[PDB]
Design a protein around this ligand. Structure first.
Ligand SMILES: C/C=C/C(=O)SCCNC(=O)CCNC(=O)[C@@H](O)C(C)(C)COP(=O)(O)OP(=O)(O)OC[C@H]1O[C@@H](n2cnc3c(N)ncnc32)[C@H](O)[C@@H]1OP(=O)(O)O
Ligand SMILES: C/C=C/C(=O)SCCNC(=O)CCNC(=O)[C@@H](O)C(C)(C)COP(=O)(O)OP(=O)(O)OC[C@H]1O[C@@H](n2cnc3c(N)ncnc32)[C@H](O)[C@@H]1OP(=O)(O)O
Ligand SMILES: NC(=O)c1ccc[n+]([C@@H]2O[C@H](COP(=O)([O-])OP(=O)(O)OC[C@H]3O[C@@H](n4cnc5c(N)ncnc54)[C@H](OP(=O)(O)O)[C@@H]3O)[C@@H](O)[C@H]2O)c1
Ligand SMILES: NC(=O)c1ccc[n+]([C@@H]2O[C@H](COP(=O)([O-])OP(=O)(O)OC[C@H]3O[C@@H](n4cnc5c(N)ncnc54)[C@H](OP(=O)(O)O)[C@@H]3O)[C@@H](O)[C@H]2O)c1
Lengths: 678, 678
């Protein structure tokens, strides 16, 4: 039975040599895959001339609303995904992660990119860099989307998560994606892609899928393309030196295997509650998803006097795990995915047993069953710093080794001897052991969890990549970063420094900056709706003289009898030389000068973004305020009962009779719209 | 005569086959370089075990003061540097840019790190990420420093600027450096390194130099190292695939050659001031440094109806240029650096002449004189969209080519046809033309200048990299980035998401976060000096009941007669339901509860960082304020007369009688120190 590929808008299939997909709990072939004789250059050409100009013609807010709509469409028909995921040998709780945590990444990116990204095709990330003495020459940074494709090469662990966490920043950035999943579990990836395509939510050409080898795709890419890899450390170092990639200098993000430590602290005795949650965390992280997640604990570093207390407490917790079929009852651990995986785990277990020891059911594995089972395995290594095969070999199954250390200076070296890891855990209760651990072992790790009694109630775990924390690590773990929040949408964009006059930078960025021309238009700017405000609508307020009575009235009403405002002997010895006006009174009298009183489109204020007081204000000194619209960035009206609205930022500039700018700042405002959208 | 290399603390010299450094304006050989038989593993050993812990034990503020002291020490003895730089064939106005821009890079990276970096060894870049529903589990991102070396490989253009723009983020990030300069002009780099080392300002092992070939250094590196390359594309694509770099996955940042454009807008006619500054900018950028900078204009795109006038004015402007010895008077353009450069520019000029045309003195360059000169060359290409050898071949001299376009849609394609560039220029006066140019041609450029009459009076130039703007480009320009501000010190660091309880993240980051434990002291925190404030010192103030008269008094004193505070009919038809207390009165009455009225260590306030109003405050509602210290970050007392001080940040949290957090924010304060440092 053929597995199709979505190329050039059409479902196609290959002709020729083929591989095939076995069932995991029984072991018969129920799909067979090939991609031979298909045109890859035409697929890239259709992607570039069709899906890239459609995505690059949207704002970021529309591109986040598209992600929320696709997420709501894929959440409803979720039960046709659990049926395909049970064929991979996973349980129900171990497939809940793969389905729901991969769909929740879309909701996370839709909520992030609607509150923090502009309503434009470009995205100015900085404020302003003044590069002159008068103010006629400045610069600022911009981020524009590339005009190519993003080629993703996934693994076999998470077909629903690992495809779809690389795809929310790709669509949110403005590029069309081509997915090449692993050919051992591609039948879930095809169902995901088919549910995306057959809904009419994304534009055409914005997603493509190849099932089988890519063949002749990396030899056709241009310098506006990006490539992301996820797999072992032996394939990605062959794909890094591919001559088109090093010729055209295209971004290649490699991310590979790792050895993830879990260090027990010196301040832990077996009567404390730390020991039980340590054992629980190690057992859960070693038995979840049959040990087939990349963020699993594989090196357990314990102190010397607590080895026999740990190695006896793990095994009694581990013998209660019943390995078998996930559909029948009483079974917690499922199976592996292939017989090749059952061979490849045990051929690494034998390499570890060439210099290690044995605590449980290790190299015993039934290599002739109709089902990819492997028993949970705990090893031991009494010479940790004289056996380099422990610190370089990961058995990608339920296997983890145990080794001792000596008082927080040998453990800090055994944790850094992994050569670049992907995750780490420390179990302590002393907050000055965690500081010494972070100051020396955060170089090799990309995510570190400190675990104690308070954190363990609502912790997500050692091996759960959150979609707003950096997922990556140096050295052996590839050297790339994913999922850093909005750090991941910047891997699909070009950063540019634009220079010129401020009145030109304001027209490029569609935001008034500081020195641009203004537009005074004879009616008050708080009387306009959202659709008739443009960035650069300015108001010059009338003046107000700050007298000596104003200082006394504000200090009486507020309560701030500070010595630079109320005393006279001590005011003549400070930095100001005499007693001055309060800063919050300047802040309040400014708002008294520009705020309109009548009922209009302005609803709420709720914000003050960045205030700096520059020069002091004295009695006998006037105040005049300039109010300028700056940024518009509407909201999406998630229901039909609600009111259409948007959020306008106004820049406020105060100055005295000498026109020098005391106290310049910026406020937020929620302005109602005339025409709704949904 | 030897050229010594400073390795392992000793000035050494090689024994073997050698290359030699000539004189650029006369022709005699006056140095000779070699590095054979030097121990390259021992230099990395000395830098890791001797110089790196001396840098990773300083704070960021001390590492910025070190840069400022080294800059002030190297600015004084600059007159030997001009004498060394005149041997390279450059004028005084071209050596000024090199030497003084190199030292101004250090002044800029000291003045940024003095203001925007903490007083710590670790650097938290986020604020807080709440990952829970109760509040006992959060995460934040840390940046720690790597524990290896930084191998910098430079080019022959800027021996003083190019070394010292890679070295300031390296030293500010806390890593040592090994500089390999280009052996064609390595006599000035050694004088720089000697003037740095013979001052006692930097630690030992913190800087190393190799004059000659690196030989075997790149086979000895580790995953905690970084490599930066600056040169041609054909060399950096051979050093990218070096089998230790791809096996250990170490960061390699290549930055290569580019074909920089300068597009003339359609709305510019020769009776405008734009035309003369266009001609001036092209001629100055082509005749500066004899066209030996990477950010020089090499393709000139003009409209079709203006080819002849531009081709006349450029030749009438360029024939006034005198090429000769720089020391004798009346000479504008200097010389090249080697006879090999004179022989290698013209073999590119002949490749361009295999399909182009000729406007001035090109391939008639005297290849037998004493001193490497080359005449200012202007070319022409009547068929730009059919000759690919214009858009791929660069001549690294005074050579630039000219070509027409057709009404702002062929020019936007000829500007992007370069294959990724390093800089670009548009000369217009219409801001919509600039919007269209940035929206289509910023994908391939890494810095774009828009030039008009306002900008031209104080523009730094087309080809001057500012130290606080991104210097890099996609595609053919390498793909790397440098000089991005504080974006470049993050290339020498590791980012880590640390998870845990807020009382543990507060101990790791040495800053109170949101939910950590507090330390109440029974004396007021505005009475302590800077050396006895700890992050976590908290004050819980008495209460104040917001009555109805307070709304009227604050609205009368400020002048804000807004309808949600003063009108009663329209307040019942708004979102709040009834009329509420002002936001600025909550801000001003919170400050009356925690401010000490007497004279003490607190000097000024001057700041307010992030204010958000959460719930509305009504009449009959009590208010209580919590005030917690957050971050200390002292200042370095630039004189011996000034009072010592630091800048303490407090976090303010207001809540009502239901303890829900109305209006939480954060303020800045300048607090005096007890004991000064200088
Ligand atoms: C191939 C390479 C080519 C080139 O680089 S050519 C570069 C051409 N650019 C220029 O000429 C500069 C352009 N100007 C701008 O952009 C201008 O916005 C500008 C950079 C002045 C802006 O003014 P700044 O005050 O920001 O200048 P700096 O950051 O460089 O220096 C400030 C700092 O340096 C100290 N300092 C002392 N003496 C000096 C000296 N002598 N020089 C520099 N800095 C000094 C001084 O104490 C000052 O203390 P603080 O302000 O309190 O931090
Ligand atoms: C290998 C893979 C491993 C894993 O992924 S394991 C991941 C484990 N993580 C978890 O289980 C979640 C942990 N929680 C956190 O981290 C928590 O910080 C958190 C993720 C709630 C933080 O809260 P968020 O607001 O960021 O969560 P969401 O943005 O996804 O949900 C809110 C948002 O989503 C929308 N929405 C609607 N339906 C849903 C549904 N059904 N789901 C999500 N979001 C939805 C809803 O309209 C809301 O609209 P707005 O607030 O106005 O923006
Ligand atoms: N985030 C992470 O760090 C992370 C996440 C998940 C998994 N991993 C690591 O990945 C490993 C398990 O996954 P894996 O076995 O699938 O790794 P793999 O064998 O190296 O293959 C990874 C992907 O590369 C493709 N591929 C293999 N050879 C290729 C070639 N010559 N040319 C082009 N593409 C090729 C594969 O497709 P085919 O199957 O068709 O060959 C597969 O999709 C584990 O070591 C695990 O630690 C790491
Ligand atoms: N920021 C930028 O984009 C930028 C800046 C400046 C210059 N450039 C470009 O650089 C070019 C001019 O510089 P260049 O001619 O000096 O470049 P290059 O000759 O090709 O080489 C650059 C550096 O690489 C070293 N190198 C060469 N072969 C090597 C090998 N086999 N192993 C190790 N190192 C080796 C050279 O040292 P040796 O000289 O001792 O052999 C030199 O220091 C121009 O094309 C210019 O556009 C770009």
């Amino acid at each position: 039975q053929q597995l199709a590929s979505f190329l050039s808008g059409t479902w196609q299939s290959g002709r020729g040599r083929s591989r095939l997909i076995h069932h995991a709990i029984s072991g018969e072939a129920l799909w067979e895959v090939t991609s031979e004789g298909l045109d890859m250059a035409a697929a890239r050409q259709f992607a570039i001339e069709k899906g890239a100009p459609a995505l690059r013609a949207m704002t970021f807010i529309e591109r986040a609303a598209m992600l929320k709509a696709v997420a709501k469409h894929l959440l409803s028909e979720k039960e046709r995904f659990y049926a395909l995921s049970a064929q991979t040998g996973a349980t129900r709780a171990d497939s809940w992660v793969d389905i729901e945590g991969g769909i929740g990444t879309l909701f996370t990116y839709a909520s992030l990119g609607s509150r923090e990204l502009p309503d434009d095709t470009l995205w100015p990330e900085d404020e302003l860099i003044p590069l002159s003495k008068e103010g006629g020459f400045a610069a600022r940074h911009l981020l524009t989307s590339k005009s190519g494709v993003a080629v993703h090469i996934n693994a076999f662990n998470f077909p629903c998560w690992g495809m779809l966490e690389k795809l929310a920043p790709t669509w949110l950035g403005g590029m069309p994606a081509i997915i090449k999943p692993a050919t051992a579990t591609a039948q879930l990836t095809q169902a995901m892609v088919k549910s995306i395509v057959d809904s009419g939510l994304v534009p055409e050409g914005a997603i493509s899928l190849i099932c089988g080898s890519a063949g002749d795709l990396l030899d056709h890419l241009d310098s506006q393309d990006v490539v992301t890899f996820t797999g072992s450390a032996a394939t990605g170092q062959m794909l890094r030196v591919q001559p088109n990639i090093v010729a055209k200098s295209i971004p290649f993000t490699m991310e590979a295997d790792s050895l993830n430590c879990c260090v027990l602290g010196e301040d832990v005795t077996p009567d404390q509650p730390e020991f039980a949650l340590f054992i629980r965390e190690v057992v859960r992280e070693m038995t979840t998803k049959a040990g087939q997640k990349c963020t699993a604990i594989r090196r357990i570093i314990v102190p010397q006097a607590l080895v026999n207390a740990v190695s006896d407490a793990l095994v009694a917790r581990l013998q209660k795990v019943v390995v078998g079929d996930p559909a029948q009852e009483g079974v917690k651990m499922g199976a592996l995915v292939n017989a090749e995986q059952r061979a490849d785990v045990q051929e690494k277990v034998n390499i570890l047993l060439a210099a290690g020891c044995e605590i449980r059911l290790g190299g015993q594995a039934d290599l002739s069953a109709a089902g990819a089972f492997f028993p949970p395995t705990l090893l031991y290594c009494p010479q940790p710093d004289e056996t380099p095969a422990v610190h370089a070999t990961e058995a990608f199954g339920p296997v983890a080794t145990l080794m001792p250390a000596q008082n927080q200076r040998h453990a800090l070296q055994l944790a850094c001897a992994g050569g670049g890891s992907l995750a780490g855990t420390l179990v302590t209760a002393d907050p000055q052991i965690a500081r010494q651990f972070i100051a020396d072992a955060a170089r090799t790790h990309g995510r570190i969890q400190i675990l104690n009694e308070e954190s363990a109630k609502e912790s997500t775990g050692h091996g759960s990549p959150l979609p707003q924390l950096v997922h990556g690590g140096p050295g052996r773990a590839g050297g790339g970063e994913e999922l850093g929040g909005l750090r991941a949408v910047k891997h699909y964009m070009q950063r540019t420094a634009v220079q010129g006059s401020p009145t030109m930078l304001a027209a490029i960025s569609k935001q008034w900056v500081r020195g641009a021309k203004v537009e005074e238009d004879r009616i008050h700017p708080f009387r306009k709706y959202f659709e008739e405000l443009q960035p650069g609508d300015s108001l010059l307020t009338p003046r107000r003289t700050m007298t000596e009575a104003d200082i006394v009235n504000f200090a009486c009403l507020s309560g701030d009898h500070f010595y630079a405002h109320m005393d006279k002997i001590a005011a003549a010895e400070s930095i100001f030389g005499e007693r001055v006006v309060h800063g919050y009174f300047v802040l309040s009298a400014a708002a008294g000068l520009f705020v309109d009183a009548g009922v209009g489109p302005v609803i709420a204020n709720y914000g003050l973004e960045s205030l700096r007081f520059i020069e002091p204000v004295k009695p006998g000194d006037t105040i005049q305020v300039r109010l300028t619209c700056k940024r518009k960035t509407l909201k999406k009206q998630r229901s039909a009962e609600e009111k259409p609205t948007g959020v306008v930022e106004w820049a406020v500039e105060v100055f005295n009779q000498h026109q020098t700018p005391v106290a310049l700042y910026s406020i937020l405002t929620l302005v109602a719209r005339q025409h709704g959208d949904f």
